[PDB]
Design a protein around this ligand. Sequence first.
Ligand SMILES: NCCCCCC(=O)NCCCCCC(=O)O
Ligand SMILES: NCCCCCC(=O)NCCCCCC(=O)O
Lengths: 384, 384
Amino acid sequence: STGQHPARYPGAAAGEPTLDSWQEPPHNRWAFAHLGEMVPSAAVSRRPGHALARLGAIAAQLPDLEQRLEQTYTDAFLVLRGTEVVAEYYRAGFAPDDRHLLMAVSKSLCGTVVGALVDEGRIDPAQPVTEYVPELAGSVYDGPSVLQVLDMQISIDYNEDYVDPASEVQTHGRSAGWRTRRHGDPADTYEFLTTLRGDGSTGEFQYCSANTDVLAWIVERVTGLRYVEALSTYLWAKLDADRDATITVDTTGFGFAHGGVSCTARDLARVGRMMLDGGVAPGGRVVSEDWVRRVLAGGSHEAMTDKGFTNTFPDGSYTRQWWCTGNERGNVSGIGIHGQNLWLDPLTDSVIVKLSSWPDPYTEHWHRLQNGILLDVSRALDAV
Amino acid sequence: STGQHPARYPGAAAGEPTLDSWQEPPHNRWAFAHLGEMVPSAAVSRRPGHALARLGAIAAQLPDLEQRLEQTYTDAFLVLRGTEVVAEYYRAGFAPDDRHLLMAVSKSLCGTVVGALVDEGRIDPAQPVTEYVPELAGSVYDGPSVLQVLDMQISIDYNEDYVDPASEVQTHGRSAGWRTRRHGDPADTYEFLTTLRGDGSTGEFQYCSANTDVLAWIVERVTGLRYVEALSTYLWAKLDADRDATITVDTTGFGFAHGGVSCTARDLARVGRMMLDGGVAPGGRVVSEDWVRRVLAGGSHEAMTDKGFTNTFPDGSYTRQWWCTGNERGNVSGIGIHGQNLWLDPLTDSVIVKLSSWPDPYTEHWHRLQNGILLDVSRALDAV
Ligand SMILES: NCCCCCC(=O)NCCCCCC(=O)O
Ligand SMILES: NCCCCCC(=O)NCCCCCC(=O)O
C-alpha cells in the first residue's frame, strides 16, 4: 500500500474516477469540467507558418544566432533582461503563446514548491523521507534525508537511460501513463517508487528522476493538496502568468513532477525572474532569500562526479533540483532532455529560456551546442 | 483497412505517434507542443467556492429559478438575448470561463461543419456515404445517403443504452479511448464504425452516436483535415470565441465528434448566435441561410417515432444533427446526456445554454425538468 493520497476531487474515493467510472455520479460533476485529466484531448483553435525572429540587440554580437537555434532544433527561445523581453524566437508552426513540454526543467519547479514548504517549516530537509512518507520504508528512500533527495545524492538501482527500451526510465513512464502499460507493471507512480532499491550509500550525485516524484509525494503528504494544485498554489498562481501551465497525470491524478510540465516560454521566464528577485514574484513571495541564495551557491562539488557535466563545467555541482555550472558567471540552470533550459545569468540580471526538440534525449553533441549558445548569449548581455 | 486518414502532423506515418513513440524523432517536435493529445493532463492554474447567480431580468418572472437549476445539477447556465448576456449562473467550483463537456451537443457542431462543406459543394447529402468513405462498404453505412446519416434515419444494430455495460455505447467508448480497452476491441473509432450492421431499412429515426462519427470521417476525406482542425477552421475559429474548445481524441488523433467537445457556456452561445444570424459569425459565414432555414424547419415528423421525445413534443422531429421540438415557439436544440442543451428561441432572438451533470445520462424525470426550465425561460423572454 502507498497510503493516503489527495482525492481527485472533494470526497472522492481512493483512485476515483477511473477511465471506466468518470461518467458515473458523483465523479461526473468533476470529470465533465476536467475531461482532459482523464482522456487525451486536442485543442480546437479559436484563431483562424513561418519562424518569428526578433533577436534584435544580441544580433549584432551573434549574427548567426538564428541558424544556431535552428541547428539545435529550437522551438521557442526568449531572453528576459531585468523585466524586459529583449530577444525572442519561435520556429515556424509554434506560436509565441503555445506551450512546450519542459521535461526535467519540471524538477526545478518541484524543488521550488519544496522550498516554499521549507520556509513555512512544514518540511525539514534534515529529516528522513520516511518522516513524511512512511510507506517508502523498505525502499531505497528508507534512510536518506529529504535534502539528499533534493540534491540527487542517493545511490539507486535505476538506469536513467532515455533510449534503452528496457531501462527503469521506461518502467517509470509505463507506471505513470507516458508509455503503454504492461501486465505486472506498477499501477501508478507511487507504487513504482516503492519498488526502487539501492546499495544504501549516499553522498555522491546520481541523477534519478524518481527523486523528484518522491519530493512531490512529500509535498502532497505535508499539504494535503494534489501536487497539481500545490504547484499552482505555491508557484504558478503567484507568477502573474499569461497562461495556465499543464502537467501530465497518472491514473490516480498524480502529476508527473519530474518531467511532465508544459508552459509558454515567456511564462517559464517568470520563474527565472522570481529566482533573480530573491524569491519574490508579483503575487507574493514564493521562496525565501536564503533558499535562492543556496541554489545560486551550488551543491558539494565533490559529490558531482558526472564526467560529462564536469568536462564542460569543472567546478559544477547540483542542488535543490538545479544544475550549477560553477563557472565564472555563476550560471545555474534547470535542464531537460531534448534541449530544455531555464538558464539564469545573475551577472546581467537575465533569464534565458530555450525550449527545443533535439532528435536525441541527450548526447555530448547537443550538450556542447546548447551550452555554447546559452553562454554566448549570456556574454552578449554584458556591459561593454 | 479503413483507408487514408489525416496525419497527426505533416509527414506523419499512419497512426503515428503512439504512446510509445511520441518522444522519438520526427514525432517529438509535434508531441512536445501537444502532449495533452497523447497523455491525460491537468491544468496548473495561473489564478490564486460559491455559486454565481446573475439571473437578473428573468428572476422576477421565475423567482425560484436558481433552485430549479440546482435541482437539475446545473454547472453553467447562460441566456443570450440578441447580442447581450441577460442572465448567468455558475455553480460553486465552476468558473464562468471554465470549459464543460458538451456530450451530444457536439453532434450539432459536427453537423454545422458538414453544412459548411455542403455550401462549398464538397459534400452532396444525396450521395451515398460510400461516395466519400468507400471503406464503409459492407457495413450498415453501405447504401444510406449522407443526409440519412445527418438525420439519423438508418436502422442500426447499436443499442444506444448509456448505462448498460454491455451495450455498443461502451464498445464505442473503448474503441475511442473514453473507456479502458479490452483485447479484441477495434483499434480506433474508424475500425469500430466498420463493424456496425443493420437490417438495411432506412427512413425511421434511430438515434445513433456512430452516425456523427461517420460524418466526421466524411469531413476528413473531403477536406484532408483532421476533424479537430476542420472543426476549428469551419466553425470555432469564426466565432470570435474567448477560449479554444477541446475535443477528446482516439489513438489515431481522431476527434470524438459525437460527444467529446468541451467549451465555455458563453462560447457555446456564440454557436447559437450564429444560427439565429442566418449562419453568419463574426469571422465570416459559417453555413448558408438555407442550411439554417432547413434546421429550423425540422425533419420529417413521421420519421420521429421516439415516444419519449414526442410525448413532450408531439410535432417534434430531427434534422442535420439538431432536435426540433415543433412547438409553438419553433424551439430547436442541441442536446447531450446529463443535461447539456444549446437551445434556440428564435421568437425572442435568444440562445439558452445549459450545461449540467445529472447523476443519470437520460431519464424521463430529468428530461421533463430540463425542458420545463428551458421553456419557462424562453417564455420569460417574451415581450409583455
Ligand atoms: N521520465 C521521462 C522524462 C524524464 C526527463 C529527464 C530529463 O529531462 N533529464 C535531464 C538530464 C539533463 C542532464 C544534463 C547534463 O548531464 O549535462
Ligand atoms: N458515447 C458516449 C457519449 C455519447 C453522448 C450521447 C448523448 O449525449 N446523447 C443525447 C441524447 C438526447 C436524447 C433526447 C431525447 O430523447 O429527448
